[PDB]
Amino acid sequence: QQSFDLLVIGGGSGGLACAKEAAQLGKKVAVADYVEPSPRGTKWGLGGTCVNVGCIPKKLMHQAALLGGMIRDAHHYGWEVAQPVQHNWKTMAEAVQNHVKSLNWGHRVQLQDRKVKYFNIKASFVDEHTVRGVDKGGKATLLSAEHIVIATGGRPRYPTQVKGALEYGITSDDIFWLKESPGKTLVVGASYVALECAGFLTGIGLDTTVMMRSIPLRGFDQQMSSLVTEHMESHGTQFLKGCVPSHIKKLPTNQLQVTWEDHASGKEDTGTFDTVLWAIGRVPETRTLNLEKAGISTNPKNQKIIVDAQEATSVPHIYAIGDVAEGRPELTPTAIKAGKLLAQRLFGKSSTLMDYSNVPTTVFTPLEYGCVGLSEEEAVALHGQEHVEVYHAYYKPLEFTVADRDASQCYIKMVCMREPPQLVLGLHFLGPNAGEVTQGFALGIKCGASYAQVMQTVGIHPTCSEEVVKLHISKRSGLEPT
Amino acid sequence: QQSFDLLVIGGGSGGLACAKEAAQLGKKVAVADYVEPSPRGTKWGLGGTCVNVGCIPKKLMHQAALLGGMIRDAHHYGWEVAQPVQHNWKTMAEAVQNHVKSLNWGHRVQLQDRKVKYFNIKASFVDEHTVRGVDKGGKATLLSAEHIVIATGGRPRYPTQVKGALEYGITSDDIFWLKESPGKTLVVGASYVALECAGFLTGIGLDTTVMMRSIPLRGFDQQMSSLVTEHMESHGTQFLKGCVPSHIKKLPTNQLQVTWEDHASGKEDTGTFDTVLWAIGRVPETRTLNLEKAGISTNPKNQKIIVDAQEATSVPHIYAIGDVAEGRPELTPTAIKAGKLLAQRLFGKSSTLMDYSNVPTTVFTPLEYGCVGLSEEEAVALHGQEHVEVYHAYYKPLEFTVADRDASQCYIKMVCMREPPQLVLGLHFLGPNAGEVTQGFALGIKCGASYAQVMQTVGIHPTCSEEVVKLHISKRSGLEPT
Numbered sequence: 001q002q003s004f005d006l007l008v009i010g011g012g013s014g015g016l017a018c019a020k021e022a023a024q025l026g027k028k029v030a031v032a033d034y035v036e037p038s039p040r041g042t043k044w045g046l047g048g049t050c051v052n053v054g055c056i057p058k059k060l061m062h063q064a065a066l067l068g069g070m071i072r073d074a075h076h077y078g079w080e081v082a083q084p085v086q087h088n089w090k091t092m093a094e095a096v097q098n099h100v101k102s103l104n105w106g107h108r109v110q111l112q113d114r115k116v117k118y119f120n121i122k123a124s125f126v127d128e129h130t131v132r133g134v135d136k137g138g139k140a141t142l143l144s145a146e147h148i149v150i151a152t153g154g155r156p157r158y159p160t161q162v163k164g165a166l167e168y169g170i171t172s173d174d175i176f177w178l179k180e181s182p183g184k185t186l187v188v189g190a191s192y193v194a195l196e197c198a199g200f201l202t203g204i205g206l207d208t209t210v211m212m213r214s215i216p217l218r219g220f221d222q223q224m225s226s227l228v229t230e231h232m233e234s235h236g237t238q239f240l241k242g243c244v245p246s247h248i249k250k251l252p253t254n255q256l257q258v259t260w261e262d263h264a265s266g267k268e269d270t271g272t273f274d275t276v277l278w279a280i281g282r283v284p285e286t287r288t289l290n291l292e293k294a295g296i297s298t299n300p301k302n303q304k305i306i307v308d309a310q311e312a313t314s315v316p317h318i319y320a321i322g323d324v325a326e327g328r329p330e331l332t333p334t335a336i337k338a339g340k341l342l343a344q345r346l347f348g349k350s351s352t353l354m355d356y357s358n359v360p361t362t363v364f365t366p367l368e369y370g371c372v373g374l375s376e377e378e379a380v381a382l383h384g385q386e387h388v389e390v391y392h393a394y395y396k397p398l399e400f401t402v403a404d405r406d407a408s409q410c411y412i413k414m415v416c417m418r419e420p421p422q423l424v425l426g427l428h429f430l431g432p433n434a435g436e437v438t439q440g441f442a443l444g445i446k447c448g449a450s451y452a453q454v455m456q457t458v459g460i461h462p463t464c465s466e467e468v469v470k471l472h473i474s475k476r477s478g479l480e481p482t
Numbered sequence: 483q484q485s486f487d488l489l490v491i492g493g494g495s496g497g498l499a500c501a502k503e504a505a506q507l508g509k510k511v512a513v514a515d516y517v518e519p520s521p522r523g524t525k526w527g528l529g530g531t532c533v534n535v536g537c538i539p540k541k542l543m544h545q546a547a548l549l550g551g552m553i554r555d556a557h558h559y560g561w562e563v564a565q566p567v568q569h570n571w572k573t574m575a576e577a578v579q580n581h582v583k584s585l586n587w588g589h590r591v592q593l594q595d596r597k598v599k600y601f602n603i604k605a606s607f608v609d610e611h612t613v614r615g616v617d618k619g620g621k622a623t624l625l626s627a628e629h630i631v632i633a634t635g636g637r638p639r640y641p642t643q644v645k646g647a648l649e650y651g652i653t654s655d656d657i658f659w660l661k662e663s664p665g666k667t668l669v670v671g672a673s674y675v676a677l678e679c680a681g682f683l684t685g686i687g688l689d690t691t692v693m694m695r696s697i698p699l700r701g702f703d704q705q706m707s708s709l710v711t712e713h714m715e716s717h718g719t720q721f722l723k724g725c726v727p728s729h730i731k732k733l734p735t736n737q738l739q740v741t742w743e744d745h746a747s748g749k750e751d752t753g754t755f756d757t758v759l760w761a762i763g764r765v766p767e768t769r770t771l772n773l774e775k776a777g778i779s780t781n782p783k784n785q786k787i788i789v790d791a792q793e794a795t796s797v798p799h800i801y802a803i804g805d806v807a808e809g810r811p812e813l814t815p816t817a818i819k820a821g822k823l824l825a826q827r828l829f830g831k832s833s834t835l836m837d838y839s840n841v842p843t844t845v846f847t848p849l850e851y852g853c854v855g856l857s858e859e860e861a862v863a864l865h866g867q868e869h870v871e872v873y874h875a876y877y878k879p880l881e882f883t884v885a886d887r888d889a890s891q892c893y894i895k896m897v898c899m900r901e902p903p904q905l906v907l908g909l910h911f912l913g914p915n916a917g918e919v920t921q922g923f924a925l926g927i928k929c930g931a932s933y934a935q936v937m938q939t940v941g942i943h944p945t946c947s948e949e950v951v952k953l954h955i956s957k958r959s960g961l962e963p964t
């Protein structure tokens with residue numbers, strides 16, 4: 001409607017967190033949220049990427065995949081389950097989507113409850129105080145606010161140069177919302193999204209292939225990333241390595257013929273799929289905002305908004321947070337916390353800056369990969385090989401023994417300073433429930449734990465996590481880690 | 483055979499760990515291990531209580547129980563599993579026992595490999611240097627060693643005053659080794675063993691009742707312990723509260739008639755069961771050792787061996803470790819580490835004492851209960867109510883949402899010093915994979931983490947463990963923790 005103390009652009013992780021906390025500190029607040037449909041026509045309700053097309057539906061479909069492995073395990077443990085059990089996509093999708101819809105509805109209620117006005121409106125900047133929104137019926141509204149927070153996230157990237165990509169392909173925005181099973185799927189890319197989605201698809205019994213141009217998980221510890229794909233490949237996910245697509249043709253059968261260049265052989269290859277998922281990175285949502293008309297600068301390389309440590313862009317009453325802000329982890333919890341701390345600096349007398357250092361993650365691949373702190377390469381880059389010590393182990397989950405499941409690849413490494421007491425720099429855990437395991441150790445890093453303090457931490461037995469506290473074989477010794 | 487550098491009595495967690503590490507430091511070592519059958523005739527191979535009748539088979543049968551819940555979850559996630567699935571005890575038991583046998587065999591091999599002589603012999607002290615062992619064929623052997631380590635563990639207690647208890651009842655020693663299903667089971671006691679076993683029995687579909695005289699889990703945080711049983715009772719485990727048995731009669735049908743006094747009503751009650759499991763604590767294995775003949779003192783109250791900080795009893799060349807040693811957590815990892823550190827102080831020039839402070843545990847109840855540090859009561863006892871701050875939360879695992887499972891009771895509390903930065907004193911987590919979650923936070927405690935450092939630790943999303951790092955509602959505020 002009118003002027004506001006705070007207007008937030010983007011009803012997502014960072015923006016809803018900021019809006020709510022601004023409204024709890026007594027402020028008059030608006031949020032504008034609009035979901036522009038994917039090129040395939042997928043759109044969804046309030047809450048942003050995590051809620052609707054990110055962490056939440058991803059985690060749940062991963063769990064669908066894990067549950068199929070649980071069912072096989074169960075017969076070793078005495079359950080007389082009738083054995084090739086079928087999976088129904090539609091039952092899954094339906095359940096997953098219903099939970100997402102309950103989150104859309106919980107966010108609306110929390111807005112209503114805190115008296116935040118939500119405008120289902122596609123905002124762009126008219127000046128540095130003012131924004132024009134257009135609803136789904138083509139109606140324009142004008143909103144201005146004293147302070148503006150842009151938390152507009154990003155969306156899936158499409159390739160250029162691949163004819164048929166835009167017409168026939170789908171992205172992570174569509175996958176969670178498919179009416180029917182995608183059947184035989186090519187996943188193009190090598191990121192955590194690519195590997196996560198490929199993973200759960202293989203896990204629910206679909207014929208799945210991953211096309212990587214180069215390395216898996218660029219920017220993640222490379223020895224870990226390669227364990228993660230080795231596991232995926234032993235467990236039924238196909239990999240086209242050193243391959244890049246060149247065009248897609250839709251066949252009379254509605255199947256999709258993919259042509260690609262294969263750099264490991266030097267030949268062009270072809271294969272036929274039911275679905276092609278592009279998961280080749282994401283682009284920040286800034287181009288439509290008319291940033292120019294507000295004086296809001298963006299780094300041209302990526303299309304992100306340039307911010308300082310207090311989350312301010314180049315216009316002083318204006319902030320950006322989450323995936324749209326340059327130099328920021330693209331994670332929900334960091335966007336949430338940043339939004340909270342910004343609300344609290346603006347309206348709450350707080351001086352607390354957001355701390356983006358040693359943030360933990362987990363990749364929810366079929367075997368999960370949890371990490372916090374430095375990769376081993378970044379450590380040796382920062383400090384020198386001779387000033388680094390690495391403790392490592394292969395281990396077998398107790399639950400894998402009776403289940404007869406493969407623990408090759410259940411591997412942990414802890415990267416440290418070499419001089420005593422050996423400050424821990426990074427932890428890397430591949431195994432079941434890796435995000436459960438990792439979290440507490442992020443606190444140890446925050447506190448400046450050493451390997452000395454790790455040796456003196458007693459294990460909980462029997463657990464996988466205790467193997468972290470049992471680590472004792474150094475890479476420098478060259479002794480057997482299994 | 484002869485004299486040895488080190489002789490260990492008890493081929494269990496602490497003793498095998500000590501023997502192996504003594505032998506890796508170049509020493510000539512013997513271990514004597516003998517399993518005296520349970521009153522019901524159950525016996526088993528090398529490795530001690532954890533391997534054969536403790537953590538390992540307990541954890542695996544818990545997992546059997548969890549897998550039955552996984553199968554129900556799976557149909558919500560799209561798996562078309564045929565639904566009341568039956569459980570076969572015998573398939574389970576067989577699998578569990580085979581894995582135990584593989585551990586018995588791995589320990590024999592590791593002894594052989596390190597050239598430790600294993601005497602399957604029931605040792606007792608003839609003097610402070612010398613021990614007589616008697617094999618299963620009644621043959622006596624004499625062994626002496628310069629240093630002796632007693633790591634003889636404990637066994638299940640039987641009640642006095644309950645006629646029929648010794649004849650008809652079984653203990654944790656028997657449960658893992660049953661040929662047939664125990665069918666309808668009364669579990670007498672209120673300890674973690676009682677609640678663990680009751681739990682997995684209910685979980686594999688057996689009609690299960692727990693008889694508690696008093697409180698659940700004496701010595702554990704009482705609000706947590708009561709959540710744990712509330713969950714067990716919502717999920718099909720029956721509880722007779724304030725009840726104590728008085729005798730058991732075997733009926734012509736071979737069923738077991740239990741009479742008890744019920745203190746909450748004041749009446750005697752009766753009920754008929756197929757199995758009665760006594761889980762009313764454990765007694766240290768010292769009475770047969772002829773400790774008297776070595777000068778080795780025991781605390782009369784319990785029958786434990788009195789040790790100092792270096793694990794020495796009252797005879798200087800002689801040590802005790804594990805469950806038999808007074809004032810020591812009865813846990814495998816503490817017994818293992820103590821054995822390692824003792825080997826290293828004796829034969830390795832180390833000065834490192836074992837640290838028994840802030841050891842983490844997990845109770846592997848149907849909903850798992852992980853903790854480390856102080857209970858809330860011990861905190862307020864040590865520091866005063868006005869000098870303590872408690873952060874708490876109810877939460878729902880994401881995986882419970884689609885599965886439609888009950889999260890009442892998924893509760894976390896973090897007990898702190900009240901003055902800033904609010905040093906963390908205790909963490910208490912009830913939820914899935916609680917031992918996975920807890921472990922890293924034990925390291926935070928070891929390092930002296932504060933609540934200030936907890937607020938600045940970023941969550942991994944979506945996980946249960948992140949809820950620990952999200953804690954913000956204090957009991958002092960009186961605000962809603964859900």
Ligand SMILES: Cc1cc2nc3c(=O)[nH]c(=O)nc-3n(C[C@H](O)[C@H](O)[C@H](O)COP(=O)(O)OP(=O)(O)OC[C@H]3O[C@@H](n4cnc5c(N)ncnc54)[C@H](O)[C@@H]3O)c2cc1C
Pocket residue numbers: 009010011012013014015032033034035036047048049050051053054055056058121122123124151152153154172193285288289321322323324329330331332333335942943944
């Ligand atoms: C498939 C996938 C899996 C993921 N898995 C995880 C994970 O497991 N853990 C994790 O931490 N993170 C995960 N993430 C990343 C996480 O979702 C993001 O880091 C987070 O959602 C970013 O939140 P945000 O505040 O920056 O913006 P978003 O949640 O992206 O919200 C932006 C909102 O603004 C809207 N918007 C854009 N422009 C306008 C405008 N002009 N007017 C009005 N509204 C507009 C968008 O439609 C959206 O609603 C995943 C992401 C994806 C794609």
Ligand SMILES: Cc1cc2nc3c(=O)[nH]c(=O)nc-3n(C[C@H](O)[C@H](O)[C@H](O)COP(=O)(O)OP(=O)(O)OC[C@H]3O[C@@H](n4cnc5c(N)ncnc54)[C@H](O)[C@@H]3O)c2cc1C
Pocket residue numbers: 460461462491492493494495496497514515516517518529530531532533535536537538540603604605606633634635636654675767770771803804805806811812813814815817
């Ligand atoms: C049902 C149950 C569940 C448990 N769950 C867990 C858990 O999940 N996590 C955990 O950490 N702990 C658990 N424990 C406790 C754990 O098993 C013990 O704390 C640990 O095994 C103690 O090891 P130890 O070295 O003291 O002796 P033990 O493993 O008990 O070994 C003692 C060995 O010595 C033998 N022995 C005794 N006397 C003689 C003698 N005269 N001559 C020769 N040999 C002799 C015994 O038969 C046995 O082999 C559990 C225990 C039980 C009963």
Ligand SMILES: Nc1ncnc2c1ncn2[C@@H]1O[C@H](COP(=O)(O)OP(=O)(O)OC[C@H]2OC[C@H](O)[C@@H]2O)[C@@H](O)[C@H]1OP(=O)(O)O
Pocket residue numbers: 159188189190191194212213214215216217218219244245279280281282283302
């Ligand atoms: N065109 C093409 N064809 C086939 N496969 C491809 C292609 N482009 C990328 N990819 C792969 O998919 C992944 C996408 O991740 P990324 O671009 O970093 O994700 P974001 O852009 O969301 O990340 C944001 C920024 O932060 C860090 C990162 O550098 C980004 O610039 C990546 O590992 C790529 O392999 P590749 O060989 O490793 O490039």
Ligand SMILES: Nc1ncnc2c1ncn2[C@@H]1O[C@H](COP(=O)(O)OP(=O)(O)OC[C@H]2OC[C@H](O)[C@@H]2O)[C@@H](O)[C@H]1OP(=O)(O)O
Pocket residue numbers: 641670671672673676694695696697698699700701726727761762763764765784
């Ligand atoms: N006779 C009888 N009838 C019915 N139920 C009973 C009976 N005796 C104990 N119990 C219950 O079973 C549990 C056994 O645990 P515990 O004796 O502490 O185990 P341990 O002896 O292995 O522990 C070693 C020591 O360390 C700590 C502890 O104090 C011990 O002394 C306990 O919670 C008891 O309830 P209760 O009401 O709480 O007594």
